[PDB]
Structure 1
Amino acid sequence: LHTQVGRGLLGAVVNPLGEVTDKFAVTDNSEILYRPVDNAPPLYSERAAIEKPFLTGIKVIDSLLTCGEGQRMGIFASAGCGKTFLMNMLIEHSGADIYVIGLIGERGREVTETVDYLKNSEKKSRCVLVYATSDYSSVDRCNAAYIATAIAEFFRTEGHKVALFIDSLTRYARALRDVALAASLPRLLERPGKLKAGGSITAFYTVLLEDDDFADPLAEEVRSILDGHIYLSRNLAQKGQFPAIDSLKSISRVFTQVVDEKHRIMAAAFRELLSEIEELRTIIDFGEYKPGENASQDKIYNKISVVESFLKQDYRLGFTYEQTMELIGETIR
């Protein structure tokens, strides 16, 4: 099985057969080539070490969860936790050369929502969208993930810094299970990375949490395979914190490899402040907080608003690395 690749797909919407069915942008490049959708992962000796940050423009991620070029990062959330808006922010406020989105959704309205977003995005000329809805077979739903990854791999071989999004691994795995009935990952999940001889694919895989923010077996397996995970808390969403990232239950496993020492120090001091705030929140809920009785508790209390203001981010705003580190420094003062 082969699929179209190349710069002529920039601005295009591609179906699970690999054909263009819609456009959210038009470009002057018409390059169309063909590649197999199944390809072995790089050899260990062809991979470069993850050592350069992949900046997202999102304050909490760039400061506490810093991604690296070539990393695979999970995004874990229940329904209604802002996963799609977080992906929109990751596309809009990062600095990749090319974005490849693979939607393994179920209803055509979600695909159309992503198409309309891209139609109004500043990144439209550098995106490719691959989709499969519930109307498509399970074979077609798995193939959409493979097509998206093969397109990203072509741009990586050209030298580009590519961001790949697969939404969602949960529905990919459900379709894979259905296909297995008729008769895989991490073979899919190990295809991203930075190549010594080429560019990089930095990949974000979404995982749905069922019921509360509970990790079914698939979620545990995915978390073990990836280089980190961002957890979106329904509880933080209902309190009105957007992005609803729970940084104390999130991790980038490459963090200390991609930021410098002064950043490490600031991030550790901020995380210690967040933990102190969570303990104080419980003490408040227990009715045991009385102003003036404990000066360290009062100091923590008076940090809550500045901390919340650092974590909060309008989805239309992106922050440079220098701005983010300036702000986190002000917060821990």
Structure 2
Amino acid sequence: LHTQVGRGLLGAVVNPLGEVTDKFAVTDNSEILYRPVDNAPPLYSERAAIEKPFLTGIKVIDSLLTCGEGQRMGIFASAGCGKTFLMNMLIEHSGADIYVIGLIGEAGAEVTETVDYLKNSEKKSRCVLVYATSDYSSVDRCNAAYIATAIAEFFRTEGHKVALFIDSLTRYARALRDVALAAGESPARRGYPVSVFDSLPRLLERPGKLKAGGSITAFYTVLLEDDDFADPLAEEVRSILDGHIYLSRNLAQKGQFPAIDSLKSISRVFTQVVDEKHRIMAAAFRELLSEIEELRTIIDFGEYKPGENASQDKIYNKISVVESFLKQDYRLGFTYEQTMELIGETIR
């Protein structure tokens, strides 16, 4: 019910008991304090409206899905869609003060993958990793999510621009269902006034930007089933968050990385965090993508023949510059100016 927080956790790997078990960076600060893990969500009069962008360095996100400081964004993906590499990019190419990762995963190998990434990351001195492997109980799996959030909330109270990653809500929620069973609850017969299942919306409302403090911008991964179908957990989470990035198994098969399907993704704060000329270019690019998709299915239907339709020929000759804009080397980050300069070149 209480855990370690503070700048002394920067560079540390924390287990579901609040224990430091490993380090991927050593830092100057030794500050170690104690805060409750079941912190209340910000009262409505304390939240500030999302109006400043959280730049990610990822071309398609910053142009078409622009995030905001304090926003909660879902990442929806099937296995093998580069979810982890997208998270790595979001850490490496954004500009947060402090990154807090909560791995609610299954394999010890998964945690070490992330530790090894952090060990060679330019951001190692400002990240904290919290983990729970498959060995741990459902209670410990859940507490890992609560510990990552509490650590991030401390840094927010200090005034920091914090980015929080929970991977995954799927395994958190499934562990939470197990904990509910210990209390005698099922999703159809819930306890009252306190249900174990209420920890899910409570966990998701803690991010945001405080009027009197910093911000927590949160990315929650949701693991999709077969042909990218969304189970009830995925649909419930889609309605609570402030947007979602959809990773398409169909874009991944084709060698597009990041496998973000822009037309099935959205940032609900988009128009609040970019200016008019950005909005205009984004709208023009999305229509170009929609026209490209329309030409892809005409091609698959065997209906495209060059020189028949000058409009189709122009859309066809745009496919290569559009694909080049979308794709991104995972070691590469782009400034906002570079991204808007590139996208403008694409729609001319």
Q: TM-score, normalised by structure 1?
A: 1.00
Deviation string, structure 1 residues 102-156 (Cα, Å, up to 9, x no partner): 0000010000100000000000000000000000000000000000000000000
Deviation string, structure 1 residues 300-320 (Cα, Å, up to 9, x no partner): 000000000000000000000
Q: What is the CA–CA distance in structure 1 between the aligned matches of 2:320 and 2:107, rounded to whole Å?
A: 39
**Runs of at least 5 residues in structure 2 that lack an aligned partner in the other structure:** 184-198
The offset of 1:99, in angstroms, is 0.0
The offset of 1:160, in angstroms, is 0.2
**What is the match of residue 209 of structure 1?**
224
SS in structure 2 at match of 1:130:
strand
Deviation string, structure 1 residues 149-184 (Cα, Å, up to 9, x no partner): 000000000000000000000000000000000002
Q: What is the CA–CA distance in structure 1 between the aligned matches of 2:342 and 2:71, rounded to whole Å?
A: 26
RMSD: 0.3
Q: Larger deviation: 208-217 or 64-73? A: 208-217
SS in structure 2 at match of 1:185:
helix
Q: What is the CA–CA distance in structure 2 between the aligned matches of 1:26 and 1:248, rounded to whole Å?
A: 42
The offset of 1:263, in angstroms, is 0.2
Q: What is the CA–CA distance in structure 1 between the aligned matches of 2:172 and 2:297, rounded to whole Å?
A: 39
Deviation string, structure 1 residues 275-298 (Cα, Å, up to 9, x no partner): 000000000000000101111010
Deviation string, structure 1 residues 226-260 (Cα, Å, up to 9, x no partner): 00000000010000000000000000000000000
The offset of 1:267, in angstroms, is 0.1
Q: Please tell me whether residue 267 in structure 1 is matched to residue 264 in structure 2.
A: no
Identity %: 99
Q: What is the CA–CA distance in structure 2 between the aligned matches of 1:310 and 1:268, rounded to whole Å?
A: 15
Q: What is the CA–CA distance in structure 2 between the aligned matches of 1:248 and 1:237, rounded to whole Å?
A: 15
SS in structure 1 at match of 2:203:
coil
The offset of 1:185, in angstroms, is 1.3
Q: What is the CA–CA distance in structure 2 between the aligned matches of 1:323 and 1:45, rounded to whole Å?
A: 37
**What is the match of residue 36 of structure 1?**
36
Q: What is the CA–CA distance in structure 2 between the aligned matches of 1:307 and 1:144, rounded to whole Å?
A: 40
Out of 230, 233, 236, the residue aligned to residue 221 of structure 1 is: 236
Q: After TM superposition, what 4+ stretches of structure 1 lie above 2 angstroms from structure 2?
A: none
Q: What is the CA–CA distance in structure 2 between the aligned matches of 1:312 and 1:204, rounded to whole Å?
A: 21
SS in structure 2 at match of 1:325:
helix
Q: What is the CA–CA distance in structure 1 between the aligned matches of 2:119 and 2:314, rounded to whole Å?
A: 47
Structure 1 residues 14-163: aligned runs within 5 Å: 14-163=14-163
Q: What is the CA–CA distance in structure 2 between the aligned matches of 1:93 and 1:52, rounded to whole Å?
A: 17
Q: What is the CA–CA distance in structure 2 between the aligned matches of 1:55 and 1:94, rounded to whole Å?
A: 6
Q: What is the CA–CA distance in structure 1 between the aligned matches of 2:71 and 2:265, rounded to whole Å?
A: 15
Q: TM-score, normalised by structure 2?
A: 0.95
Q: Larger deviation: 210-219 or 142-151? A: 210-219
Q: What is the CA–CA distance in structure 2 between the aligned matches of 1:174 and 1:107, rounded to whole Å?
A: 16
The offset of 1:273, in angstroms, is 0.2
The offset of 1:212, in angstroms, is 1.5
Deviation string, structure 1 residues 31-56 (Cα, Å, up to 9, x no partner): 00000000110011100000000000
SS in structure 2 at match of 1:35:
strand
Q: What is the CA–CA distance in structure 1 between the aligned matches of 2:76 and 2:28, rounded to whole Å?
A: 37
Q: Give the aligned length.
A: 333
The offset of 1:69, in angstroms, is 0.1
**Runs of at least 5 residues in structure 1 that lack an aligned partner in the other structure:** none
The offset of 1:211, in angstroms, is 1.4
The offset of 1:213, in angstroms, is 0.5
SS in structure 1 at match of 2:284:
helix
Q: What is the CA–CA distance in structure 1 between the aligned matches of 2:200 and 2:47, rounded to whole Å?
A: 19
SS in structure 1 at match of 2:286:
helix
Q: What is the CA–CA distance in structure 2 between the aligned matches of 1:84 and 1:91, rounded to whole Å?
A: 11
Q: What is the CA–CA distance in structure 2 between the aligned matches of 1:104 and 1:319, rounded to whole Å?
A: 30
Q: What is the CA–CA distance in structure 2 between the aligned matches of 1:178 and 1:211, rounded to whole Å?
A: 23
Deviation string, structure 1 residues 72-103 (Cα, Å, up to 9, x no partner): 00000000000000000000000000000000
SS in structure 1 at match of 2:45:
helix
Q: What is the CA–CA distance in structure 2 between the aligned matches of 1:65 and 1:225, rounded to whole Å?
A: 17
The offset of 1:17, in angstroms, is 0.4
SS in structure 1 at match of 2:176:
helix
**What is the match of residue 164 of structure 1?**
164
Q: What is the CA–CA distance in structure 2 between the aligned matches of 1:125 and 1:38, rounded to whole Å?
A: 26
